[PDB]
């Protein structure tokens, strides 16, 4: 409940700041002031059109590696077992498989872009 | 009110699911998924699963990041849709919220609701156990047995992940 | 069964309905798949924690690992579909019929 | 099914060891060294019986022995022990490390006045034998009679009477 | 240096665990007595509460087995005050 | 796809199936299904076409939904029983959900819509893998959980599968779609006997796998994906089309060919359990499959369709690659009926 | 009185952020042969307050093309998360003592990234979209290596509890044990806080203002406060993790003073790096992390897993 | 087609996690270890068909321990009766239940 | 000979990979040949996480101690000296 109280307090402070920023100042909003910013000239197309991601493969591989991040976090408690031999073998197996995956993607020109 | 933190969080979870399931633009569905992941973390922490909940939140936080980038790249639209931009999305959202509210009030009021299984309205605190785990975090010790007991699960999962990297490379080669 | 189990199973049902009722984009249905996986994680974790099945507190993590594998597969397919058609719209997966 | 036979309130009334966690931890080692016998008897009763009701008397004995231990401490070594448990109380984790000097004072006083010797590392964790006059529980789980196994392995195998006997096949 | 310090930490952890071992039997006795007392109080007040209700045996077990089953949180604290229930159920999780 | 990578992916698919068929823990069976999907998706798209990508996407979506439903069923059974072992399922709703998921994986109607599209999209070899090997794991899981299965649901799905597989094939001129619908019908035959006798399902699966392997290998040898393309084969390689005619007749179930034995034994087992209407309807509906089989046979071998002038060049050359197991597959598919009593080995 | 503690953590941290702005301006100016702000207040002390007043008395503009809900939510999320992450830190005693505080901080840092992406997307401006995509690429580059380094270092701690780091480093700093991981961790913290040479999201020289190009007045002030607070919090995390401090339980003030001084030094190093080095290209940042940091982190993680076993130095779990 | 390779080769690939009563780290007991053990021992070597009815008591006890449906129902009924009595004014919670007495240590 | 050329080229052109592979190989190899690993296993076993349940005395268990501080049973002197 302490964490809930702290989160509420921080969020309430931020929201109060937003309210004070949108209500204390004076405003003269007109169309040209609220128009999109394109370094002085007007935008050609929208900013909601597709924006090609030249690093898509790296992103999917990032998901797959975050899985390994999840799998490796229990290691601090794992070192507390009595079968330290099997624990060490499996931890090094997982880390070597992650290394192998990285090496494969790298050598196959997967970490490169475009 | 703090007697039923779990129920409130689960209802927020269902609302997030009704949000990302009505299928607004992938951005707001990702917002829903993030909110639901946080609430699920809350529930699991309330039941004593701090590591598991935090892990779900961390993994889905990263996963929805790649989803957001992909959306701005492939699943993009000139006028992205919010839950009040189309009659279909708002219909789905309202129907989902109403269906929740229906079952929520039904089970809270009626002693024993039975939609497809039988549910008892007594607070979750009832089921909790009275034992003591001593100087241990049972979730942590069980999750750490993946390296001492679950060598087979480690083998299978590691192979699956390496083959997943290979599979993504092949599926995106594109000849 | 407590009501939290009801809510989580309802979330799974809602996600399944969302996935089975496509609209236009494929990303949204992949998000519904990920939502189903999240609901399954929560249910399994609650069961394993309430029943103190210690050696089963790892099953949710394996479920999450294979859920992320599935998500990666889905995105890698969506990228090819977008490349071949220019959008992620499901209506373009229409060449194969029956 | 049947009514649960909960013990009466009077029987479960016992003198209580009303001392804080820090006080118990300060005297924990000497307490385990001195009161091992009754505590081990109660533990064996609890684990064999698997019923909290069955072992109430041994728990009463445990509480009485702990009270006697603290009474001897109060008689002979009160002040050094008070300083010791005061020191442990300050630490949130109640660590032994920060209070080594006061522990030394308490141990020396106890060794002189009462002759107690602090158990060394890895001693209180040893599995010990307990001699008991209480009978071993015959069916601690109160299990029902196990269903009778199926008959099996009658004897030798002989060829089928007329083969497969499948429709028109003669072999 | 870290090897030396961590070995010392393991030894101190063993010391703390041995203190816990020494103190556990008294704690087990106290816990069993407290659980039995709470169950008895619940049984008596229930006998008061549902004496009028028809066809209600008091303290009837929901298990066929005539074996001790560790009571759930609801059984022990079902009729206690809300503060007690919140403490027992969520104190360790919430405490920070 | 580098051949080493292809070998690894195929081994991964087979290993997922082996995990399904070797594991006593529900989690590991689901893991095997997930590995099968992961490995299979790249295999289906080994040749990159928009059709291959569409087929891979459809397959992925259907199998992912099936896997999520299966995992939900497993979790519900765990909630109501606390057991991970593959055994009787202790909750009826979980059993219904699991049956739906496994049927969707097997392509049993009303979850058949994906099979013809996927089969048409992928190549003949990927089609062979999809329609022979992929069927093994869900059928194994169903066999292990046969006792819990509600007979009505499985039988309804089987009858619908037979009917739909028969009907759709009548309208098909594409060989791959024809094979997909025939696979639906034969899978409906296999699941019909699952509540009654699993050994019959295994026998039907083996006969069907042999026949489908023979048919797909013959099509690969003839390089035909349409009826007209197969029509030309008589001019180049008559023996291939003749053996195709024999294998098609076996697939239809005509005596004395080996296709007859699975239907025969399924009918016998259903009759022993007092099932008479269901076997009669199943046998009668199998005639439609026979109809489109016979139409394909008429086009391929029994009647000589017009050829093209450029085939004269193909006459000079000979087929470079040899499928070693094809003759034994043909012989087993067509001439194994006199050896039915041997159905007690897999027993 | 816990609310008093929460306010005591929050309010002073925001003032620290305000004066950090002055310190940065002066340090960069002096490293550039200039004097930082001095006119406003004695030695420029009152410049922060003037900046805050100016920003909060300035008109906030809601872009015509913006999605207002996300546009407003993003700064709130950034500031609230920035303040939240300070809670678990032991200084020396943490406000909220969690068994898994480190994973909590990692998850909260992951959550804060969405503030940048949501702000950039809601702005509905091309530069803001480019900044959001750069933030996505930056997280992709740094998250895995950050997690692996933290795991490797915490293997010696024996837990993810931040408080126990003090006990582990009672006799020596952990930088001596893991100085390479410390270097990679410092660079990764620079990347996470979007600080030079990895200031790609804002990237004023290349993107007019990056994600905040369409933010003015109070929301921009909130984004700035979140940024600086994250800088200070990450440097404090580094100080706790590697540059441990002596803690006398009877006098916590000594530990607090030592910790504050170390964190100030690390933040000054942050400003120093911003002054010294040029900016990386986001392709180059991702390449650095994935091709250079990730393999070394994997090797060192293997090493740190093995070392406690082979040296019989496995740390106590409790 | 369940090729019991594990049993043939004596490999415990996955059976260690199959049941809650199996060996667990640090001998941490399951919440229903006793019921699960009793049910497993009862239904051992008698076949599933027999075990489904000859060990039904054990299985019902195991299910009750797992889900607490009957216990929750009884507790809810008791609470409903107590609330109805309080509304009627014919019941008063004891001071110890109301917090007027220090609970036993 | 050529191996040395490869190593020099690696150190000149890709030092980070050389260091990473060396460290990983040492992580794999060194624990096998380290005497202290068995000491780590013994330390983990010695930790008294769960209570030392007493065992009933049938009169034929000489090695099992009847009370702590008795000469029979395990000893932790090795860890104290360590």
Curated annotation (Swiss-Prot), chain A:
The chain crosses the membrane at residues 3-23, 55-75, 86-106. GO terms for molecular function: NADH dehydrogenase (ubiquinone) activity. Core subunit of respiratory chain NADH dehydrogenase (Complex I) which is composed of 45 different subunits. Interacts with TMEM186. Interacts with TMEM242. InterPro entries: NADH_UbQ/plastoQ_OxRdtase_su3 (IPR000440), NDAH_ubi_oxred_su3_sf (IPR038430). Core subunit of the mitochondrial membrane respiratory chain NADH dehydrogenase (Complex I) which catalyzes electron transfer from NADH through the respiratory chain, using ubiquinone as an electron acceptor. Essential for the catalytic activity of complex I. It is a multi-pass membrane protein. It catalyses: a ubiquinone + NADH + 5 H(+)(in) = a ubiquinol + NAD(+) + 4 H(+)(out). It comes from the Eukaryota. It is found in: Mitochondrion inner membrane. Its EC number is 7.1.1.2. It holds the Pfam family Oxidored_q4. Its main location: mitochondrion. One of its GO terms (cellular component) is respiratory chain complex I. It comes from Sus scrofa (Pig). This is NADH-ubiquinone oxidoreductase chain 3.
UniProtKB/Swiss-Prot annotation, chain B:
InterPro entries: ComplexI_Subunit6, NADH_UbQ/plastoQ_OxRdtase_su6, Nuo/plastoQ_OxRdtase_6_NuoJ. GO terms for cellular component: mitochondrial inner membrane; mitochondrion; respiratory chain complex I. One of its GO terms (biological process) is mitochondrial electron transport, NADH to ubiquinone. Its EC number is 7.1.1.2. The chain crosses the membrane at residues 1-21, 25-45, 47-67, 88-108, 149-169. It catalyses: a ubiquinone + NADH + 5 H(+)(in) = a ubiquinol + NAD(+) + 4 H(+)(out). Keywords: Electron transport, Membrane, Mitochondrion, Mitochondrion inner membrane, NAD, Respiratory chain, Translocase, Transmembrane, Transmembrane helix, Transport, Ubiquinone. The keyword Electron transport applies. It is a multi-pass membrane protein. Disulfide bonds: none annotated. It is found in: Mitochondrion inner membrane. Its main location: mitochondrion. It holds the Pfam family Oxidored_q3. GO terms for molecular function: NADH dehydrogenase (ubiquinone) activity. The keyword Membrane applies. Core subunit of respiratory chain NADH dehydrogenase (Complex I) which is composed of 45 different subunits. Belongs to the complex I subunit 6 family. Core subunit of the mitochondrial membrane respiratory chain NADH dehydrogenase (Complex I) which catalyzes electron transfer from NADH through the respiratory chain, using ubiquinone as an electron acceptor. Essential for the catalytic activity and assembly of complex I. This is NADH-ubiquinone oxidoreductase chain 6.
Curated annotation (Swiss-Prot), chain C:
One of its GO terms (cellular component) is mitochondrial inner membrane. Gene3D superfamilies: 1.10.287.3510. It is an enzyme of class 7 (translocase). It catalyses: a ubiquinone + NADH + 5 H(+)(in) = a ubiquinol + NAD(+) + 4 H(+)(out). The keyword NAD applies. Pfam families: Oxidored_q2. One of its GO terms (biological process) is ATP synthesis coupled electron transport. GO terms for molecular function: NADH dehydrogenase (ubiquinone) activity. It is found in: Mitochondrion inner membrane. Its main location: mitochondrion. It is a multi-pass membrane protein. InterPro entries: NADH_UbQ_OxRdtase_chain4L/K, NUOK/Mnh_C1-like. Its EC number is 7.1.1.2. The keyword Repressor does not apply. It comes from the Eukaryota. Belongs to the complex I subunit 4L family. This is NADH-ubiquinone oxidoreductase chain 4L. It comes from Sus scrofa.
Curated annotation (Swiss-Prot), chain G:
The keyword Cell inner membrane does not apply. Its main location: mitochondrion. One of its GO terms (molecular function) is NADH dehydrogenase (ubiquinone) activity. It is a multi-pass membrane protein. PANTHER family: NADH DEHYDROGENASE SUBUNIT 1, NADH-UBIQUINONE OXIDOREDUCTASE CHAIN 1. Core subunit of the mitochondrial membrane respiratory chain NADH dehydrogenase (Complex I) which catalyzes electron transfer from NADH through the respiratory chain, using ubiquinone as an electron acceptor. Essential for the catalytic activity and assembly of complex I. This is NADH-ubiquinone oxidoreductase chain 1. It comes from Sus scrofa (Pig).
